RNA sequence: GGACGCGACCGAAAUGGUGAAGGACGGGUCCAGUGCGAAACACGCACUGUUGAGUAGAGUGUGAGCUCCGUAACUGGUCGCGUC
């Protein structure tokens, strides 16, 4: 029933704007606090803003006072946050959360969206290049052989991976994306095999990059000696 | 004065069945207006307690929390294999609101080595001016692992860069990816690259290599 | 002694005006807190406050009681006088 949708994320320049939606369904917002909250990758939550009922008072996070601005359209059922002056460190994933019923859950936030990602960078779209890691020429470290595929060089995230169109799934690592000083992301995915297998198995890596048109299979084979 | 909520620890190893607690002090009085949060990888945080110490409709009752003055506990009677997540308490008595830095809460196993490996670049990124060397640590516990790349025996810094798996929800161990970035021309100046490993599970550290071209 | 009558003085329900008293006269005065209304603030209600807290105003109460100055029903008292 109880559902939260936020949209509008992206990626937009260092002192641009970007406005979020939060789609409301199955209660009406009209009759509960909504709430911001953010989360940068691999930090924890931090609350940004939010809109009381009845009054419409809007209270606002030290680091986005000023830049940001909360608002809620009840003929839509949404609430919004409007971003302005936006720095890197906005970068976030962006939650919308609906405070519940005072009698029912005090202050706590019962309901929260899946979240939208906003990325704050003067780098532009960018489609990854996908290299192979090919298996030793070697035999073995544990009794298996490794090989993988780097997806090197693109922006903004996100990318998925995956191994024979989704069959292959055991021993399969895909590695959290890094930020390199370039302001481009890169990973890698990695399985494990057996060494028996490398020359009559056939393991290509699937990536997508949505936001580039870049969707590339890689075929990782062993090359020589 | 911003009210600080200072949550400790920062992560805890359990096995399934303990019984763990977690802590956020206030730096001033909040009431009880705490409120704390499951988190999981990828997805939003769910509440499990509101108001210091009421259970949210449908949270199972080994979650309790308790107030102290201006300390905060969350207590998991009982650990259980879908508890393992992050947790986060929140102070809503006045705005700003704040939340506590989190507790991860990770499956305790036992120690794993890890199986290394080390991947050249492709002959496909050389083409391009960079290359990209990646040693791999696989499946390995507890997770600090010490990775040092060596070229021509000389000890790399700076120019190397790591990423760690979430913990596996079938073996319980992590993996390690890490990768040095040098420019083609310093590549090609070089002829030895080493990665070498450090883990609880290994007597001694581990140097997987290969030499530039060949094989 | 008494009945009737007149007058004066006293008393006096009521009442006009007056001016001091601050939480031990109260309030729809004011402040803080807690709960409730789909509700953290603002709005409403309820509860709670150990110098809650300025005595007539932070009051647009012709508030109650009281101080002081009057008026006064009277179907209360006392004294004098008249008649018997
Ligand atoms: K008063
Ligand atoms: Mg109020």
């Known amino acids: 029933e109880v559902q939260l949708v936020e949209s509008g994320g992206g990626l937009v320049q260092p002192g641009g704007s970007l406005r979020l939606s939060c789609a409301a369904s199955?209660?009406?917002?009209?009759?509960?606090?909504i709430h911001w909250v953010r989360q940068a990758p691999g930090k924890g939550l931090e609350w940004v803003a939010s809109?009381?009922?009845?009054?419409?008072?809007?209270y606002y996070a030290d680091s986005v006072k000023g830049r940001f601005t909360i608002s809620a359209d009840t003929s839509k059922n949404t609430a919004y946050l409007q971003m302005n002056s936006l720095r890197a460190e906005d970068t976030a994933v962006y939650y919308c959360?609906?405070?519940?019923?005072?009698?029912?859950?005090?202050?706590?936030?019962?309901?929260w969206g899946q979240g939208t990602l906003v990325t704050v960078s003067s780098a532009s779209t960018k489609g990854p290049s996908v290299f192979p890691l090919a298996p030793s020429s070697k035999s073995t470290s544990g009794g298996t052989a490794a090989l993988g595929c780097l997806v090197k060089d693109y922006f903004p995230e996100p990318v998925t991976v995956s191994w024979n169109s989704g069959a292959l799934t055991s021993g399969v690592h895909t590695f959290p994306a890094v930020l390199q000083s370039s302001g481009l992301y890169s990973l890698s995915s990695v399985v494990t095999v057996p060494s028996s297998s490398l020359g009559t198995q056939t393991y290509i890596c699937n990536v997508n990059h949505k936001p580039s048109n870049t969707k590339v299979d890689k075929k990782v084979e062993p090359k020589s000696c | 004065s911003d009210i600080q909520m200072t949550q400790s620890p920062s992560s805890l190893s359990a096995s399934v069945g303990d019984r763990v607690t977690i802590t956020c002090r206030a730096s001033?009085?909040?009431?009880?207006?705490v409120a704390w949060y499951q988190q999981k990888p990828g997805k939003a945080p769910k509440l499990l307690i509101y108001?210091?110490?009421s259970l949210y409709s449908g949270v199972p009752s080994r979650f309790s929390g308790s107030r102290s003055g201006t300390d905060f506990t969350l207590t998991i009677s009982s650990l259980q294999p879908e508890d393992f997540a992050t947790y986060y308490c929140?102070?809503?008595?006045?705005?700003?609101?704040?939340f506590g830095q989190g507790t991860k809460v990770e499956i305790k196993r036992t120690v794993a080595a890890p199986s290394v490996f080390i991947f050249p670049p492709s002959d496909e990124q050389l083409k391009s001016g960079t290359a990209s060397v990646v040693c791999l640590l696989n499946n390995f516990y507890p997770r600090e692992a010490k990775v040092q790349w060596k070229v021509d025996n000389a000890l790399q810094s700076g120019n190397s860069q790591e990423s760690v798996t979430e913990q596996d929800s079938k073996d319980s161990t992590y993996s390690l990816s890490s990768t040095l970035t040098l420019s083609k021309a310093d590549y090609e100046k070089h002829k030895v690259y080493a990665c070498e490993v450090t883990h609880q599970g290994l007597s001694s550290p581990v140097t997987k290599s290969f030499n530039r071209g060949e094989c």
């Open positions: 929140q102070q809503s008595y006045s705005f700003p609101s704040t």
């Open positions: 108001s210091a110490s």
């Open positions: 199955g209660f009406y917002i009209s009759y509960s606090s």
């Open positions: 809109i009381s009922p009845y009054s419409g008072s809007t």
């Open positions: 959360a609906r405070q519940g019923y005072r009698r029912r859950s005090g202050r706590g936030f019962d309901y």
């Open positions: 001033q009085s909040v009431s009880s207006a």
